[PDB]
Symmetry: D2
Subunit: 29 residues, 4 copies
């Protein structure tokens, strides 16, 4: 359920927030 919630929430973000997410995700992978 957490993945679905995150993906739904991503479209409240603009470019700067998406870059923050991408950097956190990359550091975790």
């Amino acid at each position: 359920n957490v993945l679905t919630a995150i993906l739904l929430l991503l479209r409240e973000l603009d470019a700067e927030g998406l870059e923050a997410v991408q950097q956190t995700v990359g550091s975790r992978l």
Copy 2:
């Protein structure tokens, strides 16, 4: 706010979920 919630939820994801977020965000950023 929404960003802070997302970053906290990322700590709960497994590898496959992280890869799906990576692919989705990359598609949003590149277009």
Copy 3:
């Protein structure tokens, strides 16, 4: 982490969304 995220997200909601949350939570308790 899920509780904190939910509580943070609640202030994006107005009265109608809060009532939806309260009804779902009550049915779960």
Copy 4:
């Protein structure tokens, strides 16, 4: 949207988390 995400996340909470959401929403609704 945010509402749909919240309702999905509620399925992941334990009893104590549900009670904390109940108390927070009730305080927001009553004021």
